[PDB]
Scaffold this motif. Sequence first.
Motif, PDB file in Angstrom:
ATOM      1  N   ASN A  49      20.023  -1.534   0.290  1.00  0.00           N
ATOM      2  CA  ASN A  49      18.963  -2.583  -0.343  1.00  0.00           C
ATOM      3  C   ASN A  49      17.703  -2.310   0.720  1.00  0.00           C
ATOM      4  N   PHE A  50      17.953  -1.727   1.938  1.00  0.00           N
ATOM      5  CA  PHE A  50      16.909  -1.555   2.669  1.00  0.00           C
ATOM      6  C   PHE A  50      16.067  -0.124   2.431  1.00  0.00           C
ATOM      7  N   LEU A  51      16.836   0.705   1.851  1.00  0.00           N
ATOM      8  CA  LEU A  51      16.100   2.197   1.517  1.00  0.00           C
ATOM      9  C   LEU A  51      15.459   1.802   0.132  1.00  0.00           C
ATOM     10  N   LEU A 119      11.215  19.703  -7.668  1.00  0.00           N
ATOM     11  CA  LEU A 119       9.931  18.819  -7.557  1.00  0.00           C
ATOM     12  C   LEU A 119       9.790  18.298  -6.189  1.00  0.00           C
ATOM     13  N   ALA A 120       8.342  17.842  -6.161  1.00  0.00           N
ATOM     14  CA  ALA A 120       8.096  17.595  -4.737  1.00  0.00           C
ATOM     15  C   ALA A 120       8.177  15.983  -4.546  1.00  0.00           C
ATOM     16  N   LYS A 121       8.954  15.412  -3.619  1.00  0.00           N
ATOM     17  CA  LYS A 121       9.120  13.980  -3.462  1.00  0.00           C
ATOM     18  C   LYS A 121       8.839  13.683  -1.929  1.00  0.00           C
ATOM     19  N   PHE A 122       8.708  12.324  -1.768  1.00  0.00           N
ATOM     20  CA  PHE A 122       8.857  11.963  -0.619  1.00  0.00           C
ATOM     21  C   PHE A 122      10.423  11.941  -0.155  1.00  0.00           C
ATOM     22  N   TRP A 123      10.709  11.892   1.150  1.00  0.00           N
ATOM     23  CA  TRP A 123      12.011  12.079   1.626  1.00  0.00           C
ATOM     24  C   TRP A 123      12.213  11.071   2.970  1.00  0.00           C
ATOM     25  N   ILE A 124      13.524  10.869   3.176  1.00  0.00           N
ATOM     26  CA  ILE A 124      14.139   9.979   4.448  1.00  0.00           C
ATOM     27  C   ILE A 124      15.375  10.481   5.068  1.00  0.00           C
ATOM     28  N   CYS A 125      14.913  10.719   6.275  1.00  0.00           N
ATOM     29  CA  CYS A 125      16.031  11.480   7.146  1.00  0.00           C
ATOM     30  C   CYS A 125      16.500  10.110   7.855  1.00  0.00           C
TER      31      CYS A 125
END
Length: 132
Positions: A49-51, A119-125
């Motif tokens: 839900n947060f992500l 494809l180029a996207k934002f990301w989350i570690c």
Amino acid sequence: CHPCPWEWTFFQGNCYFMSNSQRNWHDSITACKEVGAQLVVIKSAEEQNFLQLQSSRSNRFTWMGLSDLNQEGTWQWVDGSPLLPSFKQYWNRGEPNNVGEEDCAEFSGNGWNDDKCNLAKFWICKKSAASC
Ligand SMILES: [NH3+]Cc1cn([C@@H]2[C@@H](O[C@H]3C[C@H](C(=O)NCc4ccc(CO)cc4)[C@@H](C(=O)NCc4ccc(CO)cc4)C[C@@H]3OCCCl)O[C@H](CO)[C@@H](O)[C@@H]2O)nn1
Ligand SMILES: [Ca+2]
Ligand SMILES: [Ca+2]
Ligand SMILES: [Ca+2]
Ligand SMILES: [Cl-]
Ligand SMILES: [Cl-]
Ligand SMILES: [Cl-]
């Protein structure tokens, strides 16, 4: 003693990095590992839900650590674990549909979509908070 590295977001015992630039999925894996983290593997509804919020609110397409590159139709998190049935609800309607060969999972709108990995996207570690 900071629970997370500077500029990372603490949430429920883990630290998250939200990229401000775009990379294909394999290079997003690399970026997360260069900072001792993992392209984000989701373990709970609250975490999802947060992500999801991050992307629905920013209107950005964002990679998560989920793929079916190894075996088409088998969705597997980058930590080796399989996609639990209780999580399939988070797919957007009609997804995943593998159209044009889409083996990488992204946050897109209010749910998840499978898109093309190059494809180029934002990301989350994601990585563990330190103990304090
Ligand atoms: N977050 C970005 C996103 C991407 N998605 C994809 C998007 O896919 C579309 C759009 C896809 C696409 O990238 N098209 C090229 C295109 C690029 C850019 C523009 C902008 O002007 C227009 C067209 C299209 C596709 O993948 N075509 C390639 C292809 C080659 C060979 C085969 C047969 O093996 C199939 C496909 C497929 C979709 O077209 C539907 C009518 Cl336009 O939408 C589907 C939901 O409907 C999702 O399931 C998908 O994942 N949804 N959201
Ligand atoms: Ca494939
Ligand atoms: Ca696929
Ligand atoms: Ca798709
Ligand atoms: Cl919290
Ligand atoms: Cl960045
Ligand atoms: Cl927030």
